[PDB]
Hints:
The structure is cut from a larger assembly and holds 1 copy of chain A, 1 copy of chain B, 1 copy of chain C, 1 copy of chain D, 1 copy of chain E and 3 copies of chain F.
Chain D: H1 11-14, H2 19-26, H3 30-34
Chain E: H1 4-7, H2 21-24, H3 30-63
Chain F: E1 4-9, H1 10-28, E2 46-47, E3 55-56, E4 58-62, H2 66-72, E5 85-87, H3 96-102, H4 108-121, E6 127-133, H5 138-154, E7 158-164, H6 176-189, E8 193-196, H7 199-210, H8 217-236, H9 245-252, E9 260-266, H10 271-274, H11 281-289, E10 305-314, H12 318-330, E11 344-349, E12 366-374, H13 378-392, H14 398-402, H15 408-429
Parallel strand pairs in F: 1-4, 1-6, 4-5, 6-7, 7-8, 8-9, 10-11
Antiparallel strand pairs in F: 2-3, 9-12, 10-12
Bound molecules: guanosine-5'-triphosphate (GTP) (3 copies), guanosine-5'-diphosphate (GDP) and magnesium ion (MG) (3 copies).
GO cellular component, one term (chain F): microtubule
GO molecular function, one term (chain F): structural constituent of cytoskeleton
Family (chain F): Belongs to the tubulin family.
Amino acid sequence: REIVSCQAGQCGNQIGSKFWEVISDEHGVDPTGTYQGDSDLQLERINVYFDESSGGRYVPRAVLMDLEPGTMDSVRAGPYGQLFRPDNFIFGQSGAGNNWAKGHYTEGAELIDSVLDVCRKEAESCDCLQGFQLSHSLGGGTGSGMGTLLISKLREEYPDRIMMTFSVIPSPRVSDTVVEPYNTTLSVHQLVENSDESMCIDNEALYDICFRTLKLTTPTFGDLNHLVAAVMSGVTCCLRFPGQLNSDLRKLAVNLVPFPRLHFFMMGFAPLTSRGSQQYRGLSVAELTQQMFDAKNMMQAADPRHGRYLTASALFRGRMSTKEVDEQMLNVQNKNSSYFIEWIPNNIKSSICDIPPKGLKMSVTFIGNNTCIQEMFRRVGEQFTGMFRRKAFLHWYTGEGMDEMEFTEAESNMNDLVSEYQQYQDATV
Amino acid sequence: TIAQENAKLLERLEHAQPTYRADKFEADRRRNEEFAARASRY
Amino acid sequence: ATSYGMEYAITCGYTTDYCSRSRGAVVVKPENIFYFS
Amino acid sequence: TWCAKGIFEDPAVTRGRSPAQVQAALLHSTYEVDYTH
Amino acid sequence: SRESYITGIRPGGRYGAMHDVEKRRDNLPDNVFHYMKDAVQREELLRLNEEEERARIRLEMFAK
Amino acid sequence: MREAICIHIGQAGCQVGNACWELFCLEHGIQPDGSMPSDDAFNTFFSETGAGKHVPRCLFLDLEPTVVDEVRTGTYRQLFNPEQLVSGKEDAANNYARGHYTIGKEIVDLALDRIRKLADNCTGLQGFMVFHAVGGGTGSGLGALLLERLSVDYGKKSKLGYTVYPSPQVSTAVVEPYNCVLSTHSLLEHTDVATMLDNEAIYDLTRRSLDIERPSYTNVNRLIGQVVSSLTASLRFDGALNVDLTEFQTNLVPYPRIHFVLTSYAPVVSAEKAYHEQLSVADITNSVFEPAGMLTKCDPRHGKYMSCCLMYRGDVVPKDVNAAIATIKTKRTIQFVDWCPTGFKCGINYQPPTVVPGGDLAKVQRAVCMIANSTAIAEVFARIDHKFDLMYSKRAFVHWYVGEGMEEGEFSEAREDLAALEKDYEEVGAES
Amino acid sequence: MREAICIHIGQAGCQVGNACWELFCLEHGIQPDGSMPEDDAFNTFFSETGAGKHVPRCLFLDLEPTVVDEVRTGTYRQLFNPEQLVSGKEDAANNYARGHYTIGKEIVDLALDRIRKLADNCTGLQGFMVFHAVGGGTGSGLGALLLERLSVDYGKKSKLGYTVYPSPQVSTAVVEPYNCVLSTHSLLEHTDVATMLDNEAIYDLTRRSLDIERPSYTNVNRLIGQVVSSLTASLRFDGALNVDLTEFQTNLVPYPRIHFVLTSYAPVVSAEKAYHEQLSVADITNSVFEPAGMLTKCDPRHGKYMSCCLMYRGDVVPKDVNAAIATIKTKRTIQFVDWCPTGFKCGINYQPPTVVPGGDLAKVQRAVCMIANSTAIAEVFARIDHKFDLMYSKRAFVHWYVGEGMEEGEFSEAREDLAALEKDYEEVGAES
Amino acid sequence: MREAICIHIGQAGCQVGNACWELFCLEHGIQPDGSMPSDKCIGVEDDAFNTFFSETGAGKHVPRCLFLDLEPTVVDEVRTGTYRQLFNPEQLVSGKEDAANNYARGHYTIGKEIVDLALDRIRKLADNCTGLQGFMVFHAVGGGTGSGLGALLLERLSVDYGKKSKLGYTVYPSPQVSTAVVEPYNCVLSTHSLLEHTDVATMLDNEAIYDLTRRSLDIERPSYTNVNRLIGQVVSSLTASLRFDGALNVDLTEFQTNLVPYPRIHFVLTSYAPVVSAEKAYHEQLSVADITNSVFEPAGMLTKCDPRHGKYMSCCLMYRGDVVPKDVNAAIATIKTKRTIQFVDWCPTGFKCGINYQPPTVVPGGDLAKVQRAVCMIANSTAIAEVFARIDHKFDLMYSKRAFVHWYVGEGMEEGEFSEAREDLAALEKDYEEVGAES
Lengths: 429, 42, 37, 37, 64, 432, 432, 439
Ligand SMILES: Nc1nc2c(ncn2[C@@H]2O[C@H](COP(=O)(O)OP(=O)(O)OP(=O)(O)O)[C@@H](O)[C@H]2O)c(=O)[nH]1
Ligand SMILES: Nc1nc2c(ncn2[C@@H]2O[C@H](COP(=O)(O)OP(=O)(O)OP(=O)(O)O)[C@@H](O)[C@H]2O)c(=O)[nH]1
Ligand SMILES: Nc1nc2c(ncn2[C@@H]2O[C@H](COP(=O)(O)OP(=O)(O)OP(=O)(O)O)[C@@H](O)[C@H]2O)c(=O)[nH]1
Ligand SMILES: Nc1nc2c(ncn2[C@@H]2O[C@H](COP(=O)(O)OP(=O)(O)O)[C@@H](O)[C@H]2O)c(=O)[nH]1
Ligand SMILES: [Mg+2]
Ligand SMILES: [Mg+2]
Ligand SMILES: [Mg+2]
């Protein structure tokens, strides 16, 4: 039932702060933690993401990780910074410096004991926790190294529980550092072997959505984090609110994972409308379905038309009618049969939740195990090979205890991950 | 290997036999007619 | 069941919520009490 | 730091004659609305 | 055909009748004899209780 | 006497049974508080109390707590017993293995405790009626486990499963064919009647025959509850022809392996078209027999009917019932199998159907529900096993099942007995 | 007539007596001031004084002043006599030797003086109900000394010791196995019937049958008081079968050293579940015989019942009493010893239980309390003396006992007495 | 009368025999010294232990067992164990150097210097036993000693004692959990002897016992000790019919003729139920029908061989306790009604049952629990072709370019023996396929 969350790095910390803003907004929780909602449904399942104190204040089941102390101070300065428990902030003195080795072997290892202690405390406080959640950016040092190391340790300590990760994959268009290929290659091979579902964020697609879907002149990281936080809150809405066809995270995982290696998912939201065209658009199930499968609505930069959908899941929120929702994906299955694999008859898992996000009459989050993630992984691997072929930016990693062999092994596991999707893309019955 | 036990499974499904023959039923009906003829003086 | 519909039945016996040994033959409730009118 | 407003908010719910009332109507459940006495 | 002892159906119900298992003992060991004696006595108790509940339900339904 | 115990397994089962129970309370004049403001007819579904309070003879049981807790917080909190309302902590997660080997084992013990308490409270238990969906996890695994335990405990006592099979196209889950093919074990071995209630047929019926723009699972469950009330009214209320569960059990099931039975109900009409149509018995019987009113997505014309049982409610006359039977026999498109000449069971009840306030069904003075076993039902098993074979040809989603205490050979034996089902369906449908 | 004396020794005894007396005053309609707002029905527990009010026939004997001062300053301060409310100055310090050989002797004289006053105030005394905890120090030591004095002084009067034995897993004390072993030495000789009221059995019963998250000593004492009230109701009020303390002690004790007996009570339900269940006599008897509805964790399947005494209260009738008896004999999982064919003692009273305002039990039209001697009791004694051996191997915590005027050999003597107790439990359990 | 000679070979055989004997002595009330102190429930001078124990003038009961290992660790552990007084100073042969996973070493170089003494001891036991039913060999084909010396010993016994019954209880390699790299070599080379000079060869792989202990016993960390405890339970269950009274009495030659339809088809499948622990003993209604269903279920099988994947040819049950002929017949009828357990077409009967009134004896410190009734399967089925299809595929994959062959060649072993082993294993596959084929 309960879900405990972890935020890694500056990216993960900002995204998690936005996510907790969204969750408190949905559940009627003030920045001081007091409950201001006017319904029984908001308070019925607040224990999934929150824990009550002696004074009645609701504290999130969240932990924060960053080797730079300034990120924690920024979280304090945030509007909902007072909501978090003060002892859940585990921070170092020297930053990772965008070094996976520093965040995974030298600075992350010497600090990971405290974060594991805090997650163990939260896990014991949970009556029966559904799983673990993590938000991180694989292109950084802290979000990649410490994030992967914590995924590994939590997998070892809790083998039955389910791991969810939100990994902000970098893109050459938004390549704001130089060691994105190194960090991503060195982290994907922990993500594949230690995360039950690992869904991807690309700032390129986030900016594309902000451009030609949101039509905002100058969004910011705040708007990007809100866009990812909305779907992050919607993927777990079934636990917190009832529905005509309720589901949960384990149902989503079992329906979206046909084979163990294929747990890297799509990610999308609807209805996303511009500030002007918002009043004129009639929000319906048909509009939601039309926006879900649109390429421009995906928040990772890879064309879904190129690949085939192994499977997909639609978390519809709002009081709806069920044959409409079922038929709006049946007809998509029928008219896009070339975009869906043949050996799976039903490639869509529809889940219905009664409560939509407040401020909307209707909503949906889309999570799909598409076969075009191999394009993004291929691009990352090509960049990694280009850098690694000539010892470029390698001494920084090697001097921190890492071995030259581990880079080759990470590239090899990337190749396995790519080849699986490659050979299921063109598979024939 | 998965093709190997897929072929084995297909063979076992082909060899699968229902509970009702309708030929055992016919044989039992022949026996039933024999018993009725043994009885039923008329 | 009477000709005038469902109606309270009249019986003869002591009604006691407190099943005391001594008060077996003593009326202790207004239920057994009747008044002329 | 500035964040845009109204991105994640529908006008019919947020702004209108009875925004609190429409929010309260939304925040009920399907069993509650369909199954009443 | 002749399958009654596996089908579990005889006239008079699934339960049998009382008899002296001491007489039916013939070179059987103590464990088997004890199992048989317990089975017979307990069978008799089941039969009495089934008849009692059947009669009680008859009476109740007549009273209704 | 003649009581029947209701079991509601999974989310679908709980919601269907909850609609059934609001309909039962409305029909018997029982408020959500559980009392009659102002006749032993409710006894078969409600147990009396010394304070004059009525408690349903039901067991809601789901491995996840959302639906049951929300029912607890709902209108019928004072109606439903605090126990017999079991909630789990983690669902079966749409997994037969999780529902039957990992999570169902820690809850079936208290499930049987509740069922035993209900049976002890009962006096004339006619049988069990189990509502669940074979495509989910809890409705598959926990349902199979509970059916196994009930079969080994209560013996030959009747168990009717009003189950929601996958529909040919309108399906929610992806491993739902796995769940169906694996629940085939229990729904073939440890149940005597299995009535299919797939959602696509409900949807198309409420589209082309009931005329509301956006009905949903609520309307689906209301109509299913109307159907089950039609089935149980024969023992609930007096009539010209009264049939209990075992009365029609043998009349509907010709062979132990042949107990999956199609269903249909009519008139399913709205208020606008209710008062302009003379809904005669012949008209409603013809509407039921037509595939337009058929309640499960399967074409009868592709197969042959083996045995129908008709439940008429209202002012239906014994002349009208067999006049409709004669017209049906004269009709050629509704062909019965050669070896079953009569092929008909009839039960007439003097209680007209009751319409739930705020619902979609219109008040009609008479109605009829047909529960019919026919050879045409081989198609649902054929399509579900084709889907199972397509997904199982290279072991998709099988690691989830085998990582939760399940063997590879369980899928093989499910394919084996489903195969035996289509073969013996075909062989009993074959002409002499 | 039929007077009886209650002696509450120790902290547990004092708390249990507080619960029992707050139950008894409400049972008899006596206000806490001692005066109620031709009634010779309270005589067994209260005596009419020279003021027109009623004073209980109880003695709260304890070596430390906290609990007795709480009683003297509580709501029942005007009810209890200023005497017969004995207060010590320093407790036994959780030491059997300290409570039996050093401080027990300077207080047992005045305890016996109070007992003499109670007895010669009484006119038809039947026996003494002793409430204590063998796990602790005072209830073990002073209890042993006082029971020895009563046994040598008052002759063969009934001795009903309802004491709180150590629980299998969690115990308040750490020398608690020592205290239990050294107190059973005396209770085996000077207690006609001994009843166990261990804490975790009551905790589990109140958690799973009363649906309260955190009941406490108050709630367990309320349950114990309900048990004692049910046991004494046979003599308090007239019924179908009235049985006295002497009447059931010989029925329950087969051999002189076989007198430690389990206990159970039903129904124990909350207000939420009270109005939803039809608490039939068969249902309550089955709940009693079940291992979840009993106040001792001596799993009856581990042994064989020797003699079960049942106390029915309310509208219970002898025929469904014996129907419950017969179905209990018919139940598979429990068996009786082969030399107790009868094995059953029954007593029916017409007075239903009375609930306490602000309490935890809902009003029930009938109830049943069991006191049972069974061979499964040897398991708790085996655990207790196994713990005793574990502590005594290293001579841990023995200096405290030997420094309070206790010989070291008494530990060993009690150890082989417990060994003989388990051996002859096994002997009487062995089939002929 | 009805004596049987136990012969244990190798480390696995020695430990299996140790478990079997520690079970037998407690089942017959024999102390570790070798004497029965006093029994009142059991009649005195009862010739029930005569089959497994030979009486001595000092009231001693010397086991009719021979231990034979080319290396002294296990036999010296037995000599220094708690059964030193019980076991004969002889009958406990010790070597000086093991075969070391080498069939060639166990059969050609080191086996010849100890086979003479092994046959000396065997002839001593045969002279002592006047009603010898047969020899029960206990070993594992994985090890070099158990392969080579086992093959040599069985060949010598077959050529010396004629048509005496031979029960070869062999721990075959498991599909994945295996401890030896040349184990496919040893297994494929031992099939000559295990096919020619063995009357009934019993599948006793390891990982099946591992899974059975991890599921039925609900114990997470068991070992070879628990594996041996279960295997001894099975052995005693199937061999106590000739030691205790029962409704249906069966001897070794009495049931091997039922098990084995054809001379080459004698490899057999085992299961045992109800196998429960102390906690789960009272949690189930263990009746005859329930225990028979659990026996026929593949979950309770003691070897990795799915019954659903083949045709059952012969099958006999060994019931112990308060079982009754009606109960076993009802169990049989339920099995016929069940279709997941379907027999071969040409064998209609296919069933034998033996009933013994002696319930199983639980060893103290073991994970088993007392059961009022129990039953052990032993069945010859066509499904056993798959373990051979796995082991020969493994052997061919290893033998593709002559791996580990030099070790065998250097120990006086012909190179073509590997090819001959492959050929008659292929024949043992083909005759299984032919006999399972529909007529
Ligand atoms: N008729 C009807 N079917 C429903 C209803 N709700 C869900 N279903 C069916 O349930 C199927 C999906 O299964 P799940 O979502 O796993 O629900 P479940 O069968 O109870 O299984 P669990 O969720 O694991 O407990 C859908 O295909 C629907 O056909 C309902 O209200 N009425
Ligand atoms: N049922 C019940 N048991 C109690 C209660 N209070 C204490 N106990 C039991 O008493 C045991 C400990 O002994 P004490 O409560 O100290 O009684 P005592 O030994 O006579 O008092 P001291 O000699 O001062 O220790 C614990 O193990 C409890 O099980 C109570 O309120 N109700
Ligand atoms: N069932 C069972 N199997 C065993 C036991 N001990 C060993 N085994 C297995 O049997 C296989 C072969 O046993 P052995 O013939 O004794 O081989 P070994 O132990 O190496 O000894 P050598 O044969 O002399 O080489 C080993 O690989 C073990 O995995 C046991 O006690 N019981
Ligand atoms: N969505 C989002 N992405 C961010 C934010 N801040 C940084 N990023 C992304 O995170 C990546 C760099 O991560 P980094 O800060 O080095 O991670 P760290 O080293 O663990 O702190 C860049 O590619 C950015 O696009 C933010 O506030 N929101
Ligand atoms: Mg569910
Ligand atoms: Mg004290
Ligand atoms: Mg060796």
